[model samples]
Target: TNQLQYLQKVVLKDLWKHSFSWPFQRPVDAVKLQLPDYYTIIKNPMDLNTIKKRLENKYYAKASECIEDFNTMFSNCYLYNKPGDDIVLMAQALEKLFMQKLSQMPQ
Candidate 1:
């Protein structure tokens, strides 16, 4: 509740063009809000590297291998646990997987 109020008051105020303004295109810029877990993830680079390697080696090699490898990684990591604690980690892994695939595409 306190967090929600802070978001509404401070963050939303910065986001709005005018206090009474809503139906217009308000150019708002938001910066990344760091969390404790974010630093933990960054300090331990092996986890990200492992995910990248798994995606590169197992998933992005061919066209049909994407979803299966994604599911395998997700399940093997137990990403569906309580409150989705590892959701960000899984999202980062998926992002790497897609980026790998995109990099290999013919342009």
Candidate 2:
């Protein structure tokens, strides 16, 4: 759980803020900025359910928290600016972390 929280706070939130920005001078290309279908990667309901079964209850809560945060962040990106592929990158990162951590647990 602590690991999940740390990844959300430090890697996803803080690091992303430092890495990207909006309200720039040049307009981002419409096609280039189209957000990917993160549902296929980030918090797919089926994948989440599978992960939940594998995780202890306490860690599941943490996973849920991370998922919620990602949802909010992704939506905000769309509202503020047509998000780019970085959104997919972040989603992939979160999914990978969750998979790695959950796989480490005793089944």
Candidate 3:
């Protein structure tokens, strides 16, 4: 909840226009905020080399918050499993919720 609020208040709304394409328009593309495992199956395909280079550049450019967000989500999906915790279901739920909110955003 805190992370979601932080992203909504600080990153998505205050820092950058929600759909600003300047950084991810031409060669690098903006990916829908989704769990990484599901993204491999559901999202549009990306070239591995291009993605690697773009991510490397993004990290080098000090996009630490963005990376941290990604890392946090991934870590949650990867680490927080209990006997009854369905990781796949949880990840898909997160992905769908994110997409639904993103769809409501002005495009």
Instruction: State the lDDT of candidate 1 residue by residue for 1-107, as single tens digits.
Output: 22333322332233233332231122111124333343333322223233334443543444334334434433433432333555445444554544454444431
Q: What are the models' TM-scores?
A: 0.24, 0.28, 0.28
| Model 2 lDDT per residue over 1-107, tens place | 45654454443343334333222112334346564643433342322222223343444455556556444544443454334556555544554554454454431
| Deviation (Å) of 34 in candidate 1 | 28
Candidate 3 lDDT, 18-98, residue by residue in tens: 232223222222245433454443234322233345444544333444435534453444443343456445544444544
Q: Which residue pairs show backbone clashes in model 3?
A: none
| Global lDDT of model 3 | 0.39
The all-Cα superposition gives candidate 2 an RMSD in Å to the true structure of 11.0
Instruction: Indicate the worst ten consecutive residues by lDDT in candidate 1.
Output: 22-31
Q: Which portions of model 2 miss their true places by more than 4 Å?
A: 5-10, 13-17, 21-60, 80-107
Ranking by TM-score: 2, 3, 1
lDDT of 2 at 102: 47
**Model 2 pairs in collision:** none
TM-score of 2: 0.28
The top-ranked prediction according to TM-score is 2
How much lDDT does candidate 1 score?
0.36
| Least accurate 10 contiguous residues by lDDT in model 3 | 21-30
